Amino acid sequence: EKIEGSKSLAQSWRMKDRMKTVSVALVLCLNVGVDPPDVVKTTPCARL
Amino acid sequence: HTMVVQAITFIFKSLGLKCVQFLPQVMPTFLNVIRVCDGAIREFLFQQLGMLVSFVKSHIRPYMDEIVTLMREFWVMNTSIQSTIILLIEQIVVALGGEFKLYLPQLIPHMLRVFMHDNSPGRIVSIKLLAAIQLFGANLDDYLHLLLPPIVKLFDAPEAPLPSRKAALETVDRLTESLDFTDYASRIIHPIVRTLDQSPELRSTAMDTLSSLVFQLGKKYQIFIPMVNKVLVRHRINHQRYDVLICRIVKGYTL
Amino acid sequence: DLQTWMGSPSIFVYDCSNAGLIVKSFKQFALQREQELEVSMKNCIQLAACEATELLPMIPDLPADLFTSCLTTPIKIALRWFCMQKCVSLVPGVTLDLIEKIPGRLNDRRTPLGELNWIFTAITDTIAWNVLPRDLFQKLFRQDLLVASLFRNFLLAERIMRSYNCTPVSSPRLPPTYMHAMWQAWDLAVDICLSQLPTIIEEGTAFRHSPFFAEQLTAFQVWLTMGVENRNPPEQLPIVLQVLLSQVHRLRALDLLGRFLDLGPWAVSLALSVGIFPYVLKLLQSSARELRPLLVFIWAKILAVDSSCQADLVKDNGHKYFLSVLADPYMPAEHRTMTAFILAVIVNSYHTGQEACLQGNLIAICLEQ
């Protein structure tokens, strides 16, 4: 073999940046006790 | 018999989704009427039950088990009632949707008998049942290994007429869009390759089915490429999408 | 207007019936803003329970909040859905009531419930790595934890909702994973895990752990035997990562991972892309001397490729871990040679590392050997 160093490849594995989810928005349009007019729910329907 | 049920059908259509209220009254009687009806009315009732089911849609779940029992009992090799019931089958699938897979296993014995012994002129009752199978969708997951062999025999049988062969191939195209076909690649590809010899008329339809299957298999189709290429050259089969798809698979680009 | 008030870095979760319409209209208003920008699209992530045409399921067995539950309680619906499939016939005596009363927690991996969460995390992260392109994988499953968790659970939603004529929608479009083979492995893992529950609840039997992770390491070993050719990489590489987190199978995994790195420098590059580095670095805080020969081997192969990691090793004081190995007569001379190489890389043209190793008395230690 030749006395030469092996060329290092472009290691791109490193992460560019670290994101941080600082806050969370829970918008709940549950309308508990009321049924939306568009969908005629069945009598058992889904309650949970 | 004829006038009473024609009224109830128009009433439910005119009501909309508020007809659900009346379900507990109509259905138990209506089902018992189908049981004791005789001759022509049977067929007519099944026609009108289909309309009912199309309006009630998901709400028909409690009585669905009885309806299947009714169908199972009154399914006969009589061509007339078979075409009638197949239409009622197509309407149940759109009504229940995901919940249809609970009841399909009861119907399978009759569907497998339809393919085995179909005396319909040109097997148009089979062709109708193929069009129904297209609607089945992701319900067919747990039962595809059962239904598929009859369908495969249909498009490989040379005695069978060309229309009925086109219908089977187009069905596999649809089912490819929704179901997974990796397991059963060999069970289909070998009849297809054989079909590309015995008849040049199906060459177009069949090749379109192949491309769809190839798209679904992806890298798993690589195995068959040598063997199919041999059959394609022998009859100069030049499909645009297929040559692109093979080129894409061999290259490894994903799109 | 809704995307006016929210800023650039944001993520949107729509749990409604025609949710596809929102995703279409979101991209429209995104394009409309891009047209106005001449004279925030890739940043905005979107998850949708359904396609615009599709409707939400009305089935009393399932919860109304089917999509959110999937995203936020994957194990809970996964077991309830498992108990609704036809495959329950193969396990009689497993009702929903036993699922309610499953023992354990979601943290303790030695419990039955924590086992499933650990298995689920491995299987989902494995499916993603094998199916998605490398760029999009590190974008979603490596950038930030919370997104990675949502997409992990999104793959489960796709599987369950498919069985009810529902197609979930994502903003970075994913190829369909529902029919992947690994899902069958998930079934077996579930089967074995909650086949013991009758005995755990009623008999009070000690929950034996699943052979899943063991068998997956066995699969990785079998691949290495005839892995010389540059064929498709082994699917189980992300599973080996998940196994490193425990101690029960840590020795076996670290061994196989080293054997893998042996295959060539291409493999070490792969292992860096999947994200093995920050986990191997945490083991340098351990004091178990049995680990020392394995880490020396692994670190020599990695540092041979990417010499820039010498910066990271000085921050965490990992150079002390190896200094100890170089002053241990009982350590074989084969591993001591790699250790001297590792130090010769950390020191290479890096004034911060030379000042740090000088204080660690390297010259005196070297002369001893």
UniProtKB/Swiss-Prot annotation, chain A:
The modification Phosphoserine is found at S8. Highly expressed in skeletal muscle, and in a lesser extent in brain, lung, small intestine, kidney and placenta. It comes from the Eukaryota. O-GlcNAcylated by OGT upon glucose sufficiency, promoting interaction with small GTPases Rag (RagA/RRAGA, RagB/RRAGB, RagC/RRAGC and/or RagD/RRAGD) and subsequent recruitment of mTORC1 to lysosomal membranes, leading to activation of the mTORC1 complex. It is found in: Lysosome membrane; Cytoplasm; Cytoplasmic granule. Component of the mechanistic target of rapamycin complex 1 (mTORC1), an evolutionarily conserved central nutrient sensor that stimulates anabolic reactions and macromolecule biosynthesis to promote cellular biomass generation and growth. In response to nutrients, growth factors or amino acids, mTORC1 is recruited to the lysosome membrane and promotes protein, lipid and nucleotide synthesis by phosphorylating several substrates, such as ribosomal protein S6 kinase (RPS6KB1 and RPS6KB2) and EIF4EBP1 (4E-BP1). Belongs to the WD repeat RAPTOR family. Part of the mechanistic target of rapamycin complex 1 (mTORC1) which contains MTOR, MLST8 and RPTOR. mTORC1 associates with AKT1S1/PRAS40, which inhibits its activity. mTORC1 associates with DEPTOR, which regulates its activity. mTORC1 binds to and is inhibited by FKBP12-rapamycin. Forms a complex with MTOR under both leucine-rich and -poor conditions. Interacts with (via TOS motifs) EIF4EBP1 and RPS6KB1; interaction is independent of its association with MTOR. (Microbial infection) Interacts with vaccinia virus protein F17; this interaction dysregulates mTOR. This is Regulatory-associated protein of mTOR. The chain holds residues 37 to 84 of 1335 of the full protein.
Curated annotation (Swiss-Prot), chain B:
Expressed in numerous tissues, with highest levels in testis. The modification N6-acetyllysine is found at K251. It is found in: Lysosome membrane; Endoplasmic reticulum membrane; Golgi apparatus membrane; Cell membrane. It comes from the Eukaryota. The modification Phosphothreonine is found at T195. It is linked to Smith-Kingsmore syndrome: An autosomal dominant syndrome characterized by intellectual disability, macrocephaly, seizures, umbilical hernia, and facial dysmorphic features. Focal cortical dysplasia 2: A form of focal cortical dysplasia, a malformation of cortical development that results in medically refractory epilepsy in the pediatric population and in adults. FCORD2 is a severe form, with onset usually in childhood, characterized by disrupted cortical lamination and specific cytological abnormalities. It is classified in 2 subtypes: type IIA characterized by dysmorphic neurons and lack of balloon cells; type IIB with dysmorphic neurons and balloon cells. Serine/threonine protein kinase which is a central regulator of cellular metabolism, growth and survival in response to hormones, growth factors, nutrients, energy and stress signals. MTOR directly or indirectly regulates the phosphorylation of at least 800 proteins. Functions as part of 2 structurally and functionally distinct signaling complexes mTORC1 and mTORC2 (mTOR complex 1 and 2). This is Serine/threonine-protein kinase mTOR. The gene is MTOR. The chain holds residues 968 to 1222 of 2549 of the full protein.
